[PDB]
């Protein structure tokens, strides 16, 4: 039940330290080092409070990797709400960053920093033998982003054998973005890091924008809100490993439950019973509306019609915390009468999973006390349009050969961009060939 | 001599395969082209780099 | 962590730089004495970006400036902050300018630019690391175009992996001491289009046109002119010197704004046209005072709202106002234009609302963006070239030093290529 | 046939100076940059002489 | 237990040696009456370093002020501390000074400097423990430089395996109106490179420049400027003057200052800008004491922190304050500029703190530190030596008793081979990132 | 060189076809540009035989 | 073929003297302007005409 996470990019380190602060606040891992529930300093390793290692004389540290070439991000992290108990010996950063592109950080200037973080990965890999994949935080154009990942996934799949891993791809939002060439780095990231992967799921910042401004009636699009929401969502995801309950199955069980194919690889994370100080005051929580409000279009990370969205799988995650009795009542109150449009020639068995021992809600945030979780990790074969729109914009901007000259002299060629277009066209046309329902 | 004969012999040992099928193996065929041309050029530059 | 140098040039570039750092220290107030007037104590990094370390919290620019006419710099050294400079800028002589392009380009400058490159080389390493070059460069004089072009060339063979910021004053038929300046323009941007990273078409007769006609100012002087251009480029570079949450970095600005890396002439305009003289003294709200953002006849370039082809925009505010009205204004001014619906430019949504305290105002509204009206600016440059060159007039002044005709012929070939490519873009 | 062309590319290898311990830390970075630029051009010329002669 | 005694060589050397021994004796007080003046008996061995016991608890030097034109020795010797000596000294002859290097070095041997070797044989034998002797060598003329290099060449054979204190004085061509300066000085420092241990090349040129252009002194005489150089050399000599927590012998510091013993040229400064002339009485406390430590104004050379690669710096802080803030500011000055980053002997600093004040200003400091902007000084002297060498210029009386072209040719060749090696060590960054292994290992 | 110096001249003379086109922006503006890249390598080895005739 | 070409190397690349650092700035400037016209007119037109000689 042991895993060590790496984080690259500025927004990657932001969601990383936000989620780790939420972890340390909800396990009682105080900034005093020890957890006051027992008498073990630093942390613990018993069954599920197992995000630590015996570094000192029982001293335990929240093992994670924070990497970005731009050096001030780790300084502004280290002066945050969890100040001094981050690692004083592995916070490795560069001097000058790639500054919002792909090619320079990957091929040219990162080639003398890949081996340093590789040696750090080896030194942390000489530690405790628990291994159930990885947890890689990255974006498409936030910090270095694609530049580290496009090399390190190949390096992990060649150097470290055929070991499983998992990654976090932050899907961008042009209304709050900071670049224009995001189709190019998106298509390059999608042909590179997905074919050398084992598990992934894409989170859209525009989906957060939609569920905030269009579903919660708040008026603040700042990355702190995104960091807190990602902390909540990834905490709910990891809470199966973090707390033991009735169906306390591992993340290896999840990744050997979800993925059907190397190409058919991505879920539609369905968790929008949206909450804040507004939508948590004097409401009533039930197992009907939070489960009936899943398949609708304005609840999704990636946009899809419910009838046009075909569920190859309909896996579910529950935070539980009261009983499994009402969950096994809602398996007939909601889950049994589901004749919703499905995929042909595949089993139609709905899955549920409940994990007890409540993760504590965010302190000092916006949401009030909430109980349930409807993190229904389905998948959708009609997310081919969600990248076909980017391929269409990339076609309408790529025939003009815009921004090519910044991506010529750093090693690649026009054949690489043709191969990236070929790979995304292959993925999409494979979905309308056999992914979307066929004969 | 024998080196350039080897290099062009490996160049003609990479024929373009027939286009047939429901476009599954064609991407693997393109990958095989680009990679194998890359290491034949690598063997060429190593051989002419020792000499 | 982030450092920018201070190299200036010219006889007008030096004085617009003097006004530039005067008006960007107007909101900073860094004293030349040593009493350590801190603008904002959390902005040690954002004073260190421009004013670099020389002593304990005494932060001075990388002050090096060169010209052969010492009267102007000796005049501007007695300014408000005219003495906070290192005793290393004084690398010069008394050879004279004479509005001679050849002596700055070829003959006289080749024996003095070595000291300038040596001092910027020995000053560049005296910090954490190097990030950016900048230059206020002019074409109104003779020497400045030549030595700025050769300095950009020498920094190309000496520092390739560094950006340079090249302000460039375009010739003027309205204010001109001498008229040979078509020759000072056709062989200045001949190689500047493939030597630097980003450039500026700050005009001079469109600038005087908006100073005279559309403002009704009774001051046709260099004073208020430098005030206006210093305020406009201060509002431009406030984004680069104050990175709140956005306003991407040096190569990042070159990444998202430069397709076909020759077409890097963006035109810096400004919305409210506030000027010393006739003044408007209301709090500038967003919509009805940022309505001067899209009008093409209200900027430092000869343009047209319908005979114009934009492909990038930028807006960096300074007041603490909202963004919903900014977004709806942007949606109207981006969905209104039929000719803007081209196959290129899918996304240019870069807009800043950063809380930066200004000098006399409380907010700002800046425009940075390319167009195809720089092609008609170069077209009137070309028609002045045809007025001056088709009988080979006045070439005896300049051919005696080191020049010939084939440099002008390849310059005209590059001008024809620019005109053909921009006309291809206009009918694309 | 191209056994003199590989001697030409070995002369391009022979156009390499030493990495200059007697070299300023800004300047042998420039030597490395003009190195990688010239072998970018050499790789373009190499795939030229690989693809063109095969026909 | 330890002695370093006095001897002089130089036309501008006798005055500065007398005043320097006054200002190192001005707070100690050994009177010529014949009785002891004990006010602080914790400097017994410290005054025994320079003033040795020859009578009943009376500590006297072995000061041999030798001049071939003894008018200065006739005039300035009758001071308060200028008569408490062993009287068998000041061996003198009036054969002439003449501002000439060749006849001073060549013909005046058996006349005076043979008696000088005899008298330093005797006076280094009837004492406790020798560690060398002190001299303020001056290049103001030719005879003083010739007798100084004669003494250096003879004491490299008298006591060869012994570190002996050698100084030099850089002349002031603005003030020294001699028609030929750079022959004797350049050939003298040529000899002194391969004949000595250390050179504290204090000057009169750049100090004239800073007192006329910065200090705004209307009277730049040799008196107050000698007081300036005497305060600077007092701050230098504070290592052996005062008994600290280490009591560091200069035998150790001579090996400390050399990275390789060929090159021993660096000069001090005076960081808090003492007020001889334009006067002030303010207490120079810590931040204004350290704020002027990296200045391009006070250092007595062609000032260039940009052209600075310093090897070993040391500032004696006899002002009574702790060294934690001093070391923090030392780290700030160390890391705030990249010119100092050379990374040989990575602890190349020193903070020695005593409690004995030099003067009525109780808390103050000075600047001593390795000098690397001396390359332009060496060039500024050497190329104006070669300016008046190409046309066989000024052989009016530099046609000496023994003259060769090989001596001058080898002099300028070794001058070239020291300036070129110095500029090769100011370049070729063979420790910071200049190797081949910072960028991986394999780059063809 | 000095007889193989013209062998790179017959190498450029041998494998330089007419710029047969293939698509827009290609094979008459960028394959022509890689041919001028070859010519600038020729220029560089001309200023580098300037310094081998020096020795 | 080789005649005008190789003998033009043997003359023109043997016709480059080092400059004169001795002397004042005026004569040094004249030698610098003659240098920067001389090597440009040696490399440019000669490798242009050896480029477009017959192919």
Curated annotation (Swiss-Prot), chain A:
Keywords carried by this UniProt record: Acetylation, Cell projection, Cilium, Cytoplasm, Cytoskeleton, Flagellum, GTP-binding, Hydrolase, Isopeptide bond, Magnesium, Metal-binding, Methylation, Microtubule, Nitration, Nucleotide-binding, Phosphoprotein
Entry annotation: catalytic residues: 253
Modified residues annotated as Phosphoserine in this record: 438
In-chain residues carrying the UniProt-annotated modification N6-acetyllysine: 39
Single GO MF annotation: GTP binding
EC number(s) reported in the record: 3.6.5.-
Modification sites for 3'-nitrotyrosine: 281
Compartments in which it is found: Cytoplasm, Cytoskeleton; Cytoplasm, Cytoskeleton, Flagellum axoneme
Residues the record lists as binding Mg(2+): 70
Catalytic activity: GTP + H2O = GDP + phosphate + H(+)
Principal location class: cytoplasm
UniProt cross-references to Gene3D superfamilies, sorted A to Z: Helix hairpin bin, Tubulin/FtsZ, C-terminal domain, Tubulin/FtsZ, GTPase domain
Cofactor: Mg(2+)
This protein's GO CC annotations: cytoplasm; microtubule; motile cilium
GO biological process terms on file: microtubule cytoskeleton organization; mitotic cell cycle
Subunit structure: Heterodimer of alpha- and beta-tubulin. A typical microtubule is a hollow water-filled tube with an outer diameter of 25 nm and an inner diameter of 15 nM. Alpha-beta heterodimers associate head-to-tail to form protofilaments running lengthwise along the microtubule wall with the beta-tubulin subunit facing the microtubule plus end conferring a structural polarity. Microtubules usually have 13 protofilaments but different protofilament numbers can be found in some organisms and specialized cells.
Free-text function comment from the UniProt entry: Tubulin is the major constituent of microtubules, protein filaments consisting of alpha- and beta-tubulin heterodimers. Microtubules grow by the addition of GTP-tubulin dimers to the microtubule end, where a stabilizing cap forms. Below the cap, tubulin dimers are in GDP-bound state, owing to GTPase activity of alpha-tubulin.
Recorded family membership: Belongs to the tubulin family.
Miscellaneous notes: The highly acidic C-terminal region may bind cations such as calcium.
Protein name: Tubulin alpha-1A chain
Native source species: Sus scrofa
Gene that encodes it: TUBA1A
Curated annotation (Swiss-Prot), chain C:
GO cellular component terms listed in the entry, alphabetical order: cytoplasm; microtubule
Cofactor (UniProt): Mg(2+)
Modification type Omega-N-methylarginine: residues: 318
Disulfide bonding pattern of the chain: none
CDD domains recorded: beta_tubulin
GO molecular function annotation: GTP binding; GTPase activity; metal ion binding; structural constituent of cytoskeleton
Location(s), subcellular: Cytoplasm, Cytoskeleton
Sequence motif: MREI motif, positions: 1-4
Changes after translation: Some glutamate residues at the C-terminus are polyglycylated, resulting in polyglycine chains on the gamma-carboxyl group. Glycylation is mainly limited to tubulin incorporated into axonemes (cilia and flagella) whereas glutamylation is prevalent in neuronal cells, centrioles, axonemes, and the mitotic spindle. Both modifications can coexist on the same protein on adjacent residues, and lowering polyglycylation levels increases polyglutamylation, and reciprocally. Cilia and flagella glycylation is required for their stability and maintenance. Flagella glycylation controls sperm motility.
Cross-link (Glycyl lysine isopeptide (Lys-Gly) (interchain with G-Cter in ubiquitin)): 58, 324
Binding site for Mg(2+): 69
Modified residues (N6-acetyllysine): 58
PROSITE patterns according to UniProt: TUBULIN, TUBULIN_B_AUTOREG
Modification sites for N6-succinyllysine: 58
Residues the entry annotates as binding GTP: 11, 69, 138, 142-144, 204, 226
Modified residues (Phosphothreonine): 285, 290
UniProt KW keywords: Acetylation, Cytoplasm, Cytoskeleton, GTP-binding, Isopeptide bond, Magnesium, Metal-binding, Methylation, Microtubule, Nucleotide-binding, Phosphoprotein, Ubl conjugation
Major location category of this protein: cytoplasm
Phosphoserine: residues bearing it: 40, 172
Coiled coil: none
Gene3D superfamilies per the UniProt record, alphabetical: Helix hairpin bin, Tubulin/FtsZ, C-terminal domain, Tubulin/FtsZ, GTPase domain
Family to which the UniProt record says this protein belongs: Belongs to the tubulin family.
Other facts: The highly acidic C-terminal region may bind cations such as calcium.
Role: Tubulin is the major constituent of microtubules, a cylinder consisting of laterally associated linear protofilaments composed of alpha- and beta-tubulin heterodimers. Microtubules grow by the addition of GTP-tubulin dimers to the microtubule end, where a stabilizing cap forms. Below the cap, tubulin dimers are in GDP-bound state, owing to GTPase activity of alpha-tubulin.
Protein name in UniProt: Tubulin beta chain
Species per Swiss-Prot/TrEMBL record: Sus scrofa
From Swiss-Prot, chains D, F, G:
Residue runs in coiled coils: none
Region annotation (Homomultimerization) ranges: 8-16
Region (Disordered): 13-39
Superkingdom assignment: Viruses
Protein name, per record: Protein Rev
Biological role stated in the UniProt entry: Escorts unspliced or incompletely spliced viral pre-mRNAs (late transcripts) out of the nucleus of infected cells. These pre-mRNAs carry a recognition sequence called Rev responsive element (RRE) located in the env gene, that is not present in fully spliced viral mRNAs (early transcripts). This function is essential since most viral proteins are translated from unspliced or partially spliced pre-mRNAs which cannot exit the nucleus by the pathway used by fully processed cellular mRNAs. Rev itself is translated from a fully spliced mRNA that readily exits the nucleus.
Biased composition regions of type Basic residues, renumbered to the chain: 26-37
Short motif (Nuclear localization signal and RNA-binding (RRE)): ranges: 24-40
Entry comment on modification after translation: Asymmetrically arginine dimethylated at one site by host PRMT6. Methylation impairs the RNA-binding activity and export of viral RNA from the nucleus to the cytoplasm. The methylation site is still unclear and either occurs at Arg-25, Arg-28 or Arg-29. Asymmetrically arginine dimethylated at one site by host PRMT6. Methylation impairs the RNA-binding activity and export of viral RNA from the nucleus to the cytoplasm.
Further details from the record: HIV-1 lineages are divided in three main groups, M (for Major), O (for Outlier), and N (for New, or Non-M, Non-O). The vast majority of strains found worldwide belong to the group M. Group O seems to be endemic to and largely confined to Cameroon and neighboring countries in West Central Africa, where these viruses represent a small minority of HIV-1 strains. The group N is represented by a limited number of isolates from Cameroonian persons. The group M is further subdivided in 9 clades or subtypes (A to D, F to H, J and K).
Cellular compartment(s): Host nucleus, Host nucleolus; Host cytoplasm
Family: Belongs to the HIV-1 REV protein family.
Residues included from the entire protein: 11 to 65 of 116
């Amino acid at each position: 039940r042991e895993c060590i996470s790496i984080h690259v990019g500025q927004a990657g380190v932001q969601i990383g330290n936000a989620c780790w602060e939420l972890y340390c606040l909800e396990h009682g891992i105080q900034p005093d080092g020890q957890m006051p529930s027992d008498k073990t300093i630093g942390g613990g390793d018993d069954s599920f409070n197992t995000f630590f290692s015996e570094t000192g004389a029982g001293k335990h540290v929240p093992r994670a990797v924070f990497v970005d070439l731009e050096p001030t991000v780790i300084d502004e992290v280290r002066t945050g709400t969890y100040r001094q108990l981050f690692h004083p010996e592995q916070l490795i950063t560069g001097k000058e960053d790639a500054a919002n592109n792909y090619a320079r950080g990957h091929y040219t200037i990162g080639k003398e920093i890949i081996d340093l973080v590789l040696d750090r990965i080896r030194k942390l890999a000489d530690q405790c033998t628990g291994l159930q994949g990885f947890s890689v935080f990255h974006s498409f154009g936030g910090g270095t982003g694609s530049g580290f990942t496009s090399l390190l996934m190949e390096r992990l799949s060649v150097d470290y054998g055929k070991k499983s891993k998992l990654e976090f791809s932050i899907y961008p939002a042009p209304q709050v973005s900071t670049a224009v060439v995001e189709p190019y780095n998106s298509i390059l990231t999608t042909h590179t890091t997905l074919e050398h992967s084992d598990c992934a799921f894409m989170v859209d910042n525009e989906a957060i924008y939609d569920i905030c401004r269009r579903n919660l009636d708040i008026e603040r699009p700042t990355y702190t809100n995104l960091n807190r929401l990602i902390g909540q969502i990834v905490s709910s995801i990891t809470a199966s490993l973090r707390f033991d309950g009735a169906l306390n199955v591992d993340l290896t069980e999840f990744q050997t439950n979800l993925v059907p194919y190397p190409r058919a690889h991505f879920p539609l994370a369905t968790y929008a019973p949206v909450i804040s100080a507004e939508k948590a005051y004097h409401e009533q929580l039930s197992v009907a509306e939070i489960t009936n409000a899943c398949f609708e279009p304005a609840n999704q990370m990636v946009k899809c019609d419910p009838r046009h969205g075909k569920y190859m799988a309909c896996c579910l995650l529950y935070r539980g915390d009261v009983v499994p009795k009402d969950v096994n009542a809602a398996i007939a109150t909601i889950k049994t009468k589901r004749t919703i449009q499905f995929v042909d020639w595949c089993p139609t068995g709905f899955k549920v999973g409940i994990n007890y021992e409540p993760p504590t809600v965010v302190p000092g945030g916006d949401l009030a006390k909430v109980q349930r979780a409807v993190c229904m990790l389905s998948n959708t074969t009609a997310i081919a349009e969600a990248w076909a729109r980017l391929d269409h914009k990339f076609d309408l901007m790529y025939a003009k050969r815009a921004f090519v000259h910044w991506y010529v002299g750093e090693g690649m060629e026009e054949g690489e961009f043709s191969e990236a277009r070929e790979d995304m066209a292959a993925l999409e046309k494979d979905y309308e060939e056999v992914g979307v329902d066929s004969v | 001599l024998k080196a350039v004969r080897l290099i062009k012999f490996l160049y003609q040992s990479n024929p373009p395969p027939n286009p047939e099928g429901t476009r599954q193996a064609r991407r693997n065929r393109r990958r095989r082209w680009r990679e194998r041309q890359r290491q034949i050029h690598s063997i060429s530059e190593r051989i002419l780099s020792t000499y | 962590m982030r450092e920018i140098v201070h190299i200036q040039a010219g006889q007008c570039g030096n004085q617009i730089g003097a006004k530039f750092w005067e008006v960007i220290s107007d909101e900073h107030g860094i004293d030349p004495t040593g009493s350590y007037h801190g603008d904002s104590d959390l902005q040690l990094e954002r004073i260190n970006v421009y004013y670099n370390e020389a002593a304990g919290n005494k932060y001075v620019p990388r002050a090096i400036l060169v010209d052969l006419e010492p009267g102007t710099m000796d005049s501007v050294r007695s300014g408000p902050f005219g003495q906070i400079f290192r005793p290393d800028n004084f690398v010069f002589g008394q050879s004279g300018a004479g509005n001679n392009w050849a002596k700055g380009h070829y003959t006289e400058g080749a024996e003095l630019v070595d000291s300038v490159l040596d001092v910027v080389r020995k000053e560049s390493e005296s910090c954490d690391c190097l990030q950016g070059f900048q230059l206020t460069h002019s074409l109104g004089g003779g020497t400045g175009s030549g030595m700025g072009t050769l300095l950009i060339s020498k920094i190309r063979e000496e520092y390739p992996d560094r950006i340079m910021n090249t302000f460039s004053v375009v010739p003027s038929p309205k204010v001109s001491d001498t008229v040979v300046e078509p020759y000072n323009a056709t062989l200045s941007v001949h190689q500047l289009v493939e030597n630097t990273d980003e450039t500026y078409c700050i005009d001079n007769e469109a600038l005087y046109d908006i100073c005279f006609r559309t403002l009704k100012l009774t001051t046709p002087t260099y004073g208020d002119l430098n005030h206006l251009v210093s305020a406009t480029m201060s509002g431009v570079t406030t984004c680069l010197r104050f990175p709140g949450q956005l306003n991407a970095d040096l190569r990042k600005l070159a990444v998202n704004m430069v397709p076909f890396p020759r077409l890097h002439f963006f035109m810096p305009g400004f919305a409210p046209l506030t000027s010393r003289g006739s003044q408007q003294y209301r709090a500038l709200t967003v919509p009805e005072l940022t309505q001067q953002m899209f009008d093409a006849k209200n900027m430092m370039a000869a343009c047209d709202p319908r005979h114009g082809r934009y492909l990038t925009v930028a807006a960096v505010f300074r007041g603490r106002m909202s963004m919903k009205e900014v977004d709806e204004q942007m949606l109207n001014v981006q969905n209104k234009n039929s000719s803007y619906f081209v196959e290129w430019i899918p996304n240019n949504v870069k807009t800043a609302v950063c809380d930066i305290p200004p000098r006399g105002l409380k907010m700002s509204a800046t425009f940075i963006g390319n167009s195809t009206a720089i092609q008609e600016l170069f077209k009137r440059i070309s028609e002045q070239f045809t007025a001056m060159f088709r009988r080979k007039a006045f070439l005896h002044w300049y051919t005696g030093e080191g020049m010939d005709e084939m440099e002008f012929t390849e310059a005209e070939s590059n001008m024809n290529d620019l005109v053909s490519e921009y006309q291809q873009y206009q009918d694309a």
